[PDB]
Amino acid sequence: PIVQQMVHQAISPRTLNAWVKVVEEKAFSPEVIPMFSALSEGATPQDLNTMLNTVGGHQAAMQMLKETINEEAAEWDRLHPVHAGPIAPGQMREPRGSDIAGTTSTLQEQIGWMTHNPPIPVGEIYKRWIILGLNKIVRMYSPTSILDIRQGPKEPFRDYVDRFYKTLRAEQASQEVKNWMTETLLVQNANPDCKTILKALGPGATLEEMMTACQG
Amino acid sequence: PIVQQMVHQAISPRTLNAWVKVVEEKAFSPEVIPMFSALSEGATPQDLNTMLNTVGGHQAAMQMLKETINEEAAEWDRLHPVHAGPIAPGQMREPRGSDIAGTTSTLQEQIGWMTHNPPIPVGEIYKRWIILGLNKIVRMYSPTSILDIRQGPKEPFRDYVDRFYKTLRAEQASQEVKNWMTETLLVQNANPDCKTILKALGPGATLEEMMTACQG
Amino acid sequence: PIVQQMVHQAISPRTLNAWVKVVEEKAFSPEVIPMFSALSEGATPQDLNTMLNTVGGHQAAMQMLKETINEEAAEWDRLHPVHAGPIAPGQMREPRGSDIAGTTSTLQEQIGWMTHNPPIPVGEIYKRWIILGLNKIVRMYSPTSILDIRQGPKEPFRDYVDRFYKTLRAEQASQEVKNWMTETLLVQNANPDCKTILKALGPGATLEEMMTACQG
Amino acid sequence: PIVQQMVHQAISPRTLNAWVKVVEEKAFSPEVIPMFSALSEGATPQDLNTMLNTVGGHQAAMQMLKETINEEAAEWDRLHPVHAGPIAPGQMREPRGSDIAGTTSTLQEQIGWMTHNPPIPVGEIYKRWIILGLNKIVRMYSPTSILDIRQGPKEPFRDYVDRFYKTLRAEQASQEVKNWMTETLLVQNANPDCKTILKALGPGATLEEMMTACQG
Amino acid sequence: PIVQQMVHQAISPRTLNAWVKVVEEKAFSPEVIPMFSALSEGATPQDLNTMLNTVGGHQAAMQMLKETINEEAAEWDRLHPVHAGPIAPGQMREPRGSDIAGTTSTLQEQIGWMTHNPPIPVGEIYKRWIILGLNKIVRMYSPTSILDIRQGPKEPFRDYVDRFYKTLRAEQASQEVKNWMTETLLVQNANPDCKTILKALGPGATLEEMMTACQG
Amino acid sequence: PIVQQMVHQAISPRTLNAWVKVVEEKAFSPEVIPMFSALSEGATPQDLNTMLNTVGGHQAAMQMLKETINEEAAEWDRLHPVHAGPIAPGQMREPRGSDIAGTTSTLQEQIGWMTHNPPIPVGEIYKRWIILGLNKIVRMYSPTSILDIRQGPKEPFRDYVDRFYKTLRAEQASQEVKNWMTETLLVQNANPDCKTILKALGPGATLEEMMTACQG
Ligand SMILES: [Cl-]
Ligand SMILES: [Cl-]
Ligand SMILES: [Cl-]
Ligand SMILES: [Cl-]
Ligand SMILES: [Cl-]
Ligand SMILES: [Cl-]
Ligand SMILES: [Cl-]
Ligand SMILES: [Cl-]
Ligand SMILES: [Cl-]
Ligand SMILES: [Cl-]
Ligand SMILES: [Cl-]
Ligand SMILES: [Cl-]
């Protein structure tokens, strides 16, 4: 990664194993993405590829990921074209799609772009593309649909709500969505026992209010 | 986090795993909060969101947390309004509710606010809001009420007292409360055998005095 | 903690877990205290409270601890009074009992006192108070009395001596005491077989001398 | 390895054990190579030999590796000859094949070449040769042929695709190849149930499109 | 410990646990001493006491240790007396026996002595005294006598030799002794089968020579 | 060890445990030697003795090691004599055999020799002597002879080759030897089934070629 002068430094073995072990244990649950992002702070494209390449298995997901990167790389090339003339020896060349992905660019060039003034954030751009691909994978890997998440007759309300927002996080729900969902759908899939109470609270009720009410 | 010049540095993988493992093992017992606070020393809002987002499961608690942050963000916006004019290129903009929560602010802006002279402590303000939400969750997750914590006929007094203050800590008791509780309620829920002795000590008796007396 | 300029630095996650795991495994055996002291080198009151607050369970001991701190805080206030006038903006205020305990003082103020010339060692003063409270807890948590520690007919002398000084350490024996104990009480609770030999050594005999003699 | 002045520093014990444990657990699965590359960032030939020599077992693979290095060393000597005159005391000598491999060169000389201006990247050249040898080993160690990777009548499409690209990665498929393979061969080895759908998508279909279609 | 200006730094939690775990696992086998010495490089008397005090159990050994320190402290006081006049405010006082042991001296004073020019090596002197006490403990804790270490009729010679020098190391054998022992006693306690060969080698024979001869 | 000014620094607890655990698990397999060398980069004689002394068990090997060091120390003294006059106070004395081994030299003197300009590499010289002794031990500890390593009728060729070069590495085979061995002896100890094919390849055949041929 890059760290403060701004200097490249090689990825740590603890960071490498941390990421690999998370994928082994968690597969593609939603929380793996913000963990990925955290372990990859200030990461170059090489660092990012290193983290992705070190994962054994889930090679279907890894292939789908490369497809998403191609689309973003293609769109980048459309919005950011570059001439194919002779490269100027003194100063850096302009990065195209595959350079940001780290397939057609050296570590020297990646550092050059990230540490320049003003910097070309090729690591931030590429991480962006990866999170987009990882979100597609989480969406696809989500076991259950939100419609099949309903409170069991003898299930604690807290457990039902945990499964509800666990599922809802996997299915890529915006806060706009999540907030409407809690108002609408959360109540309707609850127990008849619970739903009787929950209606009594009526409108705008907090999840705090709802969960204390149905503790019974 | 921010560390001494005051510079941002990326959260460590040991800190990340430390927090995640504590939630896996302890769930929402009272001691998880001061641990959270310790692992998040000098943390930016991004760091704080990273720590919260990396937790898998307890998504009911995570939703309730976001609700508490909205309330604090709303109250912040009331007490600290800002104009919607054109942003001055040279100098920082003024942070509103969602900027402190890290949803509508970049890492650059978060560092800018925290490292300024005088600093706008957006990390300390946001951590404040989170602890308030976490305390609500601990309160709700507390298994037993203090009224059901009573000394068993064949239970050591120390074990009874451990359960008593364990429960009492979860139910959000101030030192004002805790000190009155030890005087009043601790004695009344003890064994008849013990209570006979404990009264003999009478008033103002220490917990040290009480525990040595009932060792028998 | 504070480290060399003298600068505050946040407690490490390895130090935090180290302390928590020691309490989980050892409870309140005597050796937990010098371990506590070692993990808390140069610790501020906040650091010290962090270490104490992170411990789950033993909440009876934690309450007794707070009682000991109140007594030391009260005695400190008696011996070190302070005026309740307006606080001088430029320079630090004088610390009272609860400021040293970290309940009524900020981290800024704690650093200010510890890093001043001359320094007000609020961390050393507070650690002092804590060790006093922890020693009370170890004393109370000691399973057996020294009088019930006697050599079994078929017990190796080394094992008997280990239990003897293990118990004796828990019961808060000064070196003045320990040295008299080895002369007097250690010999009398030994086996008749052993005691026959041990008397033969007579007076001033070393533990080295005693243990080699009874190896048989 | 070499790190920023550019200075040699000895390989870490965490890095050493990290590499050894990966070989113990994973043997020669494809992901071991980018892990090797990551643990060996800025590595000297000595560091690289240290990492290779510390591996117990797979001595057949280690021998094949040395054979690949000889070929690259021989080709290097052909393309980069050097005179056998007297060595100039003041300045460095020119590196030949075995010097890059670290068999006939000291650590001093390896540092000298890597830290010079302009540098002779003997670590990068040697790592290159090693990855070429490791890829030969992975190819040979691949358990199954891509032709025997077919979707079982009662196998989830995702599992079939994971085995497909797992196998395909071991057999050294270029992106040129992989992209043609997904178009052609992936579809033909699927279930009759699946293949009926997959054809319906027809041409250019994404793996994202294919996997959602056959989720059924 | 003290490290390079020469500055005190607090003992690490990894070093603390490393030492504690070694005593838990190994008890007082000979190799524990050079491990102790290594974990205590540049250690102050406080650091040394911290390491000794953190050990739970073996309190018989810990008591014997304190007895050895008293003897060395007493001998130090005899050979290095000091006046009991008023202490000079500006400059350090002269260390007596208990000051080196860390019982009657502060950390400030310990640093003062160790970092002075010329330095008074109170850490090296005290470590010296401790190793002397630890060697007494290892001697006493040695399970078997060298006379009972004999080669079993069906025992490999290597295993016999391992037990021989394992025992011999515990019983505090100098190289003067060890070298005479290999010549004399090692041969006589071997098998009749082996001893027939071993004599054939006769005088001055290496352990290398002896072990290859009896491999049969 | 010594690290960049060139300064001594105390061996790490992670390095110490790393070495000890490797000997516990691997005993004296060939790969333990390059691991030893890696953990001991820039090590002083004290560091080297620390690493050797911390090993519990294999005391037969440790004794044989000391014998090899004596021989190298004796040869050093022959080739590098020194006068027994009065030592010059200002400047370093010249190191003799036992000084390099760390038995008759202080840490100060060891640092003095290693950090001088020009340096006397007492750590490199001593490590040299140790590897020579460790290679003797590996040779002796090798379980099987290369003559008894033959391909089983129903054994995969890869497994046979792994055992072949595993054994061959223990028996101290030079690359001159190893390369002749693969040509000659590897083929003759293979299966009749395999040997029929392997001859067909004939002369100069690679191990890569041989292993792919007999995969069947
Ligand atoms: Cl790869
Ligand atoms: Cl793979
Ligand atoms: Cl997230
Ligand atoms: Cl989740
Ligand atoms: Cl708390
Ligand atoms: Cl608790
Ligand atoms: Cl080797
Ligand atoms: Cl091997
Ligand atoms: Cl103590
Ligand atoms: Cl103890
Ligand atoms: Cl030793
Ligand atoms: Cl031993």
Short mmCIF file of N, CA, C and O in Angstrom, two decimals, chain A residues 56-147:
data_model
loop_
_atom_site.label_atom_id
_atom_site.label_comp_id
_atom_site.label_asym_id
_atom_site.label_seq_id
_atom_site.Cartn_x
_atom_site.Cartn_y
_atom_site.Cartn_z
N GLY A 56 -8.27 -19.22 -2.74
CA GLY A 56 -8.48 -20.48 -3.41
C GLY A 56 -9.90 -20.86 -3.38
O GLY A 56 -10.52 -20.75 -2.37
N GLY A 57 -10.44 -21.24 -4.50
CA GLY A 57 -11.83 -21.62 -4.55
C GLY A 57 -12.66 -20.40 -4.73
O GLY A 57 -12.12 -19.37 -4.85
N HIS A 58 -13.96 -20.55 -4.80
CA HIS A 58 -14.82 -19.51 -5.37
C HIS A 58 -14.32 -18.93 -6.69
O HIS A 58 -14.35 -17.72 -6.89
N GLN A 59 -13.87 -19.79 -7.59
CA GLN A 59 -13.33 -19.33 -8.87
C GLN A 59 -14.43 -18.93 -9.85
O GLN A 59 -14.15 -18.26 -10.85
N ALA A 60 -15.66 -19.33 -9.57
CA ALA A 60 -16.83 -18.83 -10.31
C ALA A 60 -17.02 -17.37 -10.00
O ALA A 60 -17.21 -16.55 -10.91
N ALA A 61 -16.98 -17.03 -8.71
CA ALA A 61 -17.09 -15.64 -8.26
C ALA A 61 -15.96 -14.78 -8.80
O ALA A 61 -16.17 -13.66 -9.21
N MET A 62 -14.75 -15.33 -8.79
CA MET A 62 -13.56 -14.62 -9.29
C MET A 62 -13.66 -14.32 -10.78
O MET A 62 -13.18 -13.29 -11.24
N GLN A 63 -14.29 -15.22 -11.53
CA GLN A 63 -14.49 -15.00 -12.96
C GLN A 63 -15.52 -13.91 -13.20
O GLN A 63 -15.30 -13.01 -14.00
N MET A 64 -16.65 -13.98 -12.49
CA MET A 64 -17.68 -12.93 -12.55
C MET A 64 -17.10 -11.56 -12.18
O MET A 64 -17.53 -10.54 -12.71
N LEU A 65 -16.16 -11.56 -11.24
CA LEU A 65 -15.51 -10.34 -10.81
C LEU A 65 -14.74 -9.72 -11.98
O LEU A 65 -14.91 -8.54 -12.28
N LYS A 66 -13.92 -10.53 -12.66
CA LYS A 66 -13.17 -10.07 -13.82
C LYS A 66 -14.07 -9.51 -14.92
O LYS A 66 -13.69 -8.57 -15.62
N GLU A 67 -15.26 -10.08 -15.08
CA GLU A 67 -16.25 -9.57 -16.04
C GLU A 67 -16.73 -8.17 -15.69
O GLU A 67 -16.88 -7.33 -16.57
N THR A 68 -16.99 -7.93 -14.40
CA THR A 68 -17.39 -6.61 -13.93
C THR A 68 -16.28 -5.59 -14.14
O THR A 68 -16.54 -4.45 -14.52
N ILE A 69 -15.03 -5.99 -13.89
CA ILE A 69 -13.87 -5.12 -14.11
C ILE A 69 -13.71 -4.75 -15.58
O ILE A 69 -13.37 -3.61 -15.89
N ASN A 70 -13.95 -5.70 -16.48
CA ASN A 70 -13.91 -5.42 -17.92
C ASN A 70 -14.91 -4.35 -18.33
O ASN A 70 -14.59 -3.46 -19.11
N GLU A 71 -16.13 -4.44 -17.79
CA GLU A 71 -17.18 -3.46 -18.07
C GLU A 71 -16.79 -2.07 -17.60
O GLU A 71 -16.97 -1.09 -18.32
N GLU A 72 -16.26 -1.99 -16.38
CA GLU A 72 -15.81 -0.72 -15.81
C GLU A 72 -14.59 -0.18 -16.53
O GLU A 72 -14.44 1.03 -16.69
N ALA A 73 -13.71 -1.09 -16.95
CA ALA A 73 -12.53 -0.73 -17.73
C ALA A 73 -12.92 -0.21 -19.10
O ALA A 73 -12.33 0.75 -19.60
N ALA A 74 -13.92 -0.84 -19.71
CA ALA A 74 -14.43 -0.43 -21.02
C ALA A 74 -15.09 0.94 -20.94
O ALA A 74 -14.88 1.79 -21.81
N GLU A 75 -15.90 1.15 -19.90
CA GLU A 75 -16.57 2.43 -19.68
C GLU A 75 -15.56 3.53 -19.38
O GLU A 75 -15.72 4.67 -19.81
N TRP A 76 -14.51 3.19 -18.62
CA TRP A 76 -13.43 4.12 -18.34
C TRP A 76 -12.74 4.56 -19.63
O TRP A 76 -12.49 5.75 -19.83
N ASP A 77 -12.45 3.60 -20.51
CA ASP A 77 -11.80 3.89 -21.79
C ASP A 77 -12.66 4.78 -22.68
O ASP A 77 -12.13 5.62 -23.42
N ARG A 78 -13.98 4.60 -22.62
CA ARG A 78 -14.90 5.44 -23.36
C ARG A 78 -14.85 6.88 -22.85
O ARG A 78 -14.69 7.82 -23.62
N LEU A 79 -14.99 7.03 -21.53
CA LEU A 79 -15.01 8.35 -20.90
C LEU A 79 -13.62 8.99 -20.79
O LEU A 79 -13.51 10.21 -20.64
N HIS A 80 -12.56 8.18 -20.85
CA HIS A 80 -11.18 8.67 -20.73
C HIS A 80 -10.28 8.07 -21.81
O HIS A 80 -9.45 7.20 -21.52
N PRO A 81 -10.42 8.53 -23.07
CA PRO A 81 -9.54 8.06 -24.14
C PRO A 81 -8.11 8.59 -24.03
O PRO A 81 -7.86 9.56 -23.30
N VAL A 82 -7.19 7.95 -24.74
CA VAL A 82 -5.78 8.35 -24.76
C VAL A 82 -5.16 8.07 -26.13
O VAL A 82 -5.51 7.09 -26.78
N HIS A 83 -4.24 8.93 -26.55
CA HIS A 83 -3.55 8.78 -27.84
C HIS A 83 -2.54 7.63 -27.81
O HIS A 83 -2.00 7.29 -26.74
N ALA A 84 -2.28 7.04 -28.97
CA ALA A 84 -1.33 5.93 -29.10
C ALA A 84 -0.02 6.38 -29.75
O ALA A 84 0.62 5.60 -30.49
N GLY A 85 0.40 7.61 -29.47
CA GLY A 85 1.66 8.14 -29.97
C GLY A 85 2.86 7.63 -29.18
O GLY A 85 2.72 6.73 -28.34
N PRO A 86 4.06 8.19 -29.45
CA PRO A 86 5.25 7.79 -28.70
C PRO A 86 5.21 8.30 -27.25
O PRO A 86 4.83 9.45 -27.02
N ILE A 87 5.61 7.45 -26.31
CA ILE A 87 5.56 7.78 -24.89
C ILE A 87 6.71 8.73 -24.52
O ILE A 87 7.86 8.52 -24.93
N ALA A 88 6.38 9.80 -23.78
CA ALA A 88 7.37 10.79 -23.36
C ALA A 88 8.25 10.22 -22.23
O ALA A 88 7.73 9.83 -21.18
N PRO A 89 9.58 10.15 -22.46
CA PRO A 89 10.48 9.51 -21.48
C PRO A 89 10.47 10.14 -20.09
O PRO A 89 10.47 9.41 -19.09
N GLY A 90 10.47 11.46 -20.03
CA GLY A 90 10.55 12.18 -18.76
C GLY A 90 9.37 11.96 -17.82
O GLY A 90 9.56 11.66 -16.64
N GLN A 91 8.15 12.10 -18.35
CA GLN A 91 6.94 12.11 -17.53
C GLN A 91 6.03 10.90 -17.77
O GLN A 91 6.10 10.26 -18.82
N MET A 92 5.20 10.61 -16.77
CA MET A 92 4.24 9.49 -16.81
C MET A 92 3.31 9.48 -18.02
O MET A 92 2.96 10.54 -18.56
N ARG A 93 2.89 8.28 -18.41
CA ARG A 93 1.85 8.12 -19.43
C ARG A 93 0.48 8.13 -18.76
O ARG A 93 0.37 7.95 -17.55
N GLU A 94 -0.57 8.34 -19.56
CA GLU A 94 -1.94 8.39 -19.05
C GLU A 94 -2.52 6.98 -18.93
O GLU A 94 -2.42 6.19 -19.86
N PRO A 95 -3.14 6.67 -17.77
CA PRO A 95 -3.63 5.31 -17.53
C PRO A 95 -4.95 5.02 -18.24
O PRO A 95 -5.89 5.81 -18.15
N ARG A 96 -5.01 3.89 -18.94
CA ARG A 96 -6.25 3.41 -19.55
C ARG A 96 -6.83 2.28 -18.71
O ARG A 96 -6.27 1.91 -17.69
N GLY A 97 -7.96 1.73 -19.15
CA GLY A 97 -8.72 0.75 -18.36
C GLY A 97 -7.94 -0.38 -17.71
O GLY A 97 -8.06 -0.61 -16.51
N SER A 98 -7.14 -1.08 -18.50
CA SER A 98 -6.38 -2.23 -18.02
C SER A 98 -5.20 -1.85 -17.13
O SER A 98 -4.70 -2.69 -16.37
N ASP A 99 -4.74 -0.60 -17.22
CA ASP A 99 -3.69 -0.09 -16.34
C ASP A 99 -4.17 0.06 -14.91
O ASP A 99 -3.44 -0.22 -13.96
N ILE A 100 -5.41 0.50 -14.75
CA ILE A 100 -6.03 0.66 -13.43
C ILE A 100 -6.29 -0.71 -12.80
O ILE A 100 -6.17 -0.87 -11.58
N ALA A 101 -6.64 -1.68 -13.63
CA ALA A 101 -6.87 -3.05 -13.18
C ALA A 101 -5.58 -3.78 -12.84
O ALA A 101 -5.62 -4.85 -12.24
N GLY A 102 -4.44 -3.22 -13.23
CA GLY A 102 -3.13 -3.76 -12.87
C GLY A 102 -2.61 -4.85 -13.79
O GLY A 102 -1.59 -5.47 -13.51
N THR A 103 -3.32 -5.09 -14.90
CA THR A 103 -2.95 -6.15 -15.84
C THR A 103 -1.89 -5.68 -16.84
O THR A 103 -1.05 -6.47 -17.27
N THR A 104 -1.94 -4.40 -17.21
CA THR A 104 -1.02 -3.83 -18.20
C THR A 104 -0.16 -2.69 -17.64
O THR A 104 0.34 -1.86 -18.41
N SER A 105 0.03 -2.66 -16.33
CA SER A 105 0.81 -1.60 -15.68
C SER A 105 1.75 -2.18 -14.62
O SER A 105 1.40 -3.14 -13.93
N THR A 106 2.94 -1.59 -14.50
CA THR A 106 3.92 -2.02 -13.50
C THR A 106 3.65 -1.37 -12.16
O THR A 106 2.85 -0.44 -12.06
N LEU A 107 4.32 -1.86 -11.12
CA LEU A 107 4.20 -1.29 -9.77
C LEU A 107 4.74 0.15 -9.76
O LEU A 107 4.17 1.01 -9.09
N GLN A 108 5.83 0.38 -10.49
CA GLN A 108 6.42 1.71 -10.62
C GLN A 108 5.38 2.72 -11.13
O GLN A 108 5.23 3.80 -10.58
N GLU A 109 4.67 2.34 -12.20
CA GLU A 109 3.64 3.19 -12.80
C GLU A 109 2.46 3.42 -11.85
O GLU A 109 1.93 4.53 -11.79
N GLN A 110 2.06 2.37 -11.13
CA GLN A 110 0.98 2.47 -10.15
C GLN A 110 1.32 3.43 -9.00
O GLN A 110 0.49 4.24 -8.60
N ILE A 111 2.55 3.34 -8.50
CA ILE A 111 3.04 4.27 -7.48
C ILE A 111 3.08 5.69 -8.07
O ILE A 111 2.62 6.64 -7.42
N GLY A 112 3.61 5.81 -9.28
CA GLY A 112 3.71 7.09 -9.97
C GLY A 112 2.39 7.84 -10.05
O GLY A 112 2.33 9.04 -9.79
N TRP A 113 1.33 7.12 -10.40
CA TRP A 113 0.00 7.72 -10.52
C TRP A 113 -0.59 8.10 -9.16
O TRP A 113 -1.17 9.17 -9.01
N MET A 114 -0.43 7.23 -8.16
CA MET A 114 -1.02 7.45 -6.85
C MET A 114 -0.31 8.51 -6.02
O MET A 114 -0.94 9.19 -5.20
N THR A 115 1.00 8.67 -6.22
CA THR A 115 1.81 9.61 -5.42
C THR A 115 2.08 10.95 -6.12
O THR A 115 2.81 11.78 -5.59
N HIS A 116 1.48 11.16 -7.29
CA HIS A 116 1.68 12.40 -8.06
C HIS A 116 0.88 13.54 -7.45
O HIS A 116 -0.01 13.32 -6.63
N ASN A 117 1.21 14.78 -7.84
CA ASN A 117 0.47 15.96 -7.42
C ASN A 117 -0.01 16.76 -8.63
O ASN A 117 0.81 17.43 -9.28
N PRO A 118 -1.31 16.71 -8.96
CA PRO A 118 -2.36 15.94 -8.26
C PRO A 118 -2.27 14.45 -8.57
O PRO A 118 -1.78 14.07 -9.63
N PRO A 119 -2.74 13.60 -7.64
CA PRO A 119 -2.67 12.15 -7.85
C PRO A 119 -3.79 11.62 -8.73
O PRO A 119 -4.89 12.18 -8.73
N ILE A 120 -3.49 10.57 -9.49
CA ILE A 120 -4.51 9.81 -10.21
C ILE A 120 -4.81 8.57 -9.36
O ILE A 120 -4.02 7.63 -9.34
N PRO A 121 -5.95 8.57 -8.63
CA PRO A 121 -6.18 7.51 -7.65
C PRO A 121 -6.56 6.15 -8.26
O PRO A 121 -7.72 5.72 -8.17
N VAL A 122 -5.59 5.49 -8.89
CA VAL A 122 -5.87 4.22 -9.59
C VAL A 122 -6.27 3.10 -8.63
O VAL A 122 -7.01 2.19 -9.01
N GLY A 123 -5.77 3.16 -7.39
CA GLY A 123 -6.16 2.21 -6.36
C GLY A 123 -7.60 2.39 -5.91
O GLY A 123 -8.33 1.41 -5.75
N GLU A 124 -8.00 3.64 -5.70
CA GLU A 124 -9.38 3.96 -5.31
C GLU A 124 -10.37 3.67 -6.43
O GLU A 124 -11.48 3.17 -6.17
N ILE A 125 -9.98 3.95 -7.67
CA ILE A 125 -10.83 3.67 -8.83
C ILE A 125 -11.03 2.17 -9.00
O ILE A 125 -12.15 1.70 -9.23
N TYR A 126 -9.94 1.41 -8.88
CA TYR A 126 -9.99 -0.04 -9.05
C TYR A 126 -10.74 -0.72 -7.92
O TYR A 126 -11.50 -1.66 -8.15
N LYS A 127 -10.55 -0.24 -6.69
CA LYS A 127 -11.29 -0.77 -5.53
C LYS A 127 -12.79 -0.55 -5.69
O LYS A 127 -13.59 -1.38 -5.32
N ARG A 128 -13.11 0.54 -6.28
CA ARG A 128 -14.46 0.87 -6.60
C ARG A 128 -15.07 -0.18 -7.48
O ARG A 128 -16.16 -0.65 -7.24
N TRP A 129 -14.38 -0.51 -8.55
CA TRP A 129 -14.82 -1.51 -9.51
C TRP A 129 -14.98 -2.88 -8.86
O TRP A 129 -15.89 -3.64 -9.19
N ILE A 130 -14.07 -3.21 -7.94
CA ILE A 130 -14.09 -4.50 -7.26
C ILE A 130 -15.29 -4.63 -6.33
O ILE A 130 -15.97 -5.65 -6.36
N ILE A 131 -15.54 -3.61 -5.51
CA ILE A 131 -16.71 -3.61 -4.61
C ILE A 131 -18.01 -3.77 -5.40
O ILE A 131 -18.92 -4.48 -4.95
N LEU A 132 -18.10 -3.13 -6.57
CA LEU A 132 -19.26 -3.32 -7.45
C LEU A 132 -19.43 -4.77 -7.85
O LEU A 132 -20.54 -5.28 -7.87
N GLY A 133 -18.33 -5.43 -8.18
CA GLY A 133 -18.35 -6.86 -8.54
C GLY A 133 -18.63 -7.75 -7.35
O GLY A 133 -19.34 -8.74 -7.49
N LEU A 134 -18.06 -7.41 -6.18
CA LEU A 134 -18.29 -8.18 -4.97
C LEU A 134 -19.75 -8.10 -4.50
O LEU A 134 -20.29 -9.08 -3.99
N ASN A 135 -20.37 -6.93 -4.67
CA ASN A 135 -21.78 -6.76 -4.34
C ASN A 135 -22.69 -7.61 -5.22
O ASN A 135 -23.71 -8.13 -4.75
N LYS A 136 -22.34 -7.76 -6.50
CA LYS A 136 -23.06 -8.66 -7.41
C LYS A 136 -22.96 -10.11 -6.93
O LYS A 136 -23.94 -10.85 -6.99
N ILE A 137 -21.79 -10.48 -6.45
CA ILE A 137 -21.54 -11.84 -5.96
C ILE A 137 -22.31 -12.13 -4.68
O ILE A 137 -22.91 -13.20 -4.54
N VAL A 138 -22.31 -11.17 -3.75
CA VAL A 138 -23.07 -11.31 -2.50
C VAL A 138 -24.56 -11.46 -2.80
O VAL A 138 -25.23 -12.31 -2.22
N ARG A 139 -25.07 -10.62 -3.71
CA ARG A 139 -26.46 -10.69 -4.15
C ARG A 139 -26.80 -12.09 -4.65
O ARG A 139 -27.82 -12.66 -4.27
N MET A 140 -25.94 -12.64 -5.51
CA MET A 140 -26.14 -13.97 -6.08
C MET A 140 -25.99 -15.08 -5.04
O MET A 140 -26.70 -16.09 -5.09
N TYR A 141 -25.06 -14.91 -4.11
CA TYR A 141 -24.78 -15.92 -3.08
C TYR A 141 -25.78 -15.91 -1.91
O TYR A 141 -25.75 -16.81 -1.07
N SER A 142 -26.66 -14.90 -1.85
CA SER A 142 -27.67 -14.82 -0.80
C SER A 142 -28.57 -16.06 -0.81
O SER A 142 -29.24 -16.32 -1.81
N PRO A 143 -28.57 -16.84 0.29
CA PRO A 143 -29.33 -18.10 0.32
C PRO A 143 -30.83 -17.95 0.14
O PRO A 143 -31.42 -18.59 -0.73
N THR A 144 -31.45 -17.09 0.96
CA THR A 144 -32.90 -16.95 1.00
C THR A 144 -33.38 -15.60 0.48
O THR A 144 -32.65 -14.62 0.51
N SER A 145 -34.62 -15.59 0.01
CA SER A 145 -35.31 -14.36 -0.35
C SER A 145 -35.98 -13.77 0.89
O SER A 145 -36.36 -14.50 1.80
N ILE A 146 -36.13 -12.45 0.90
CA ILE A 146 -36.75 -11.74 2.02
C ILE A 146 -38.19 -12.21 2.26
O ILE A 146 -38.68 -12.15 3.39
N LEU A 147 -38.86 -12.66 1.20
CA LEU A 147 -40.24 -13.16 1.30
C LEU A 147 -40.38 -14.44 2.12
O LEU A 147 -41.43 -14.68 2.71
#
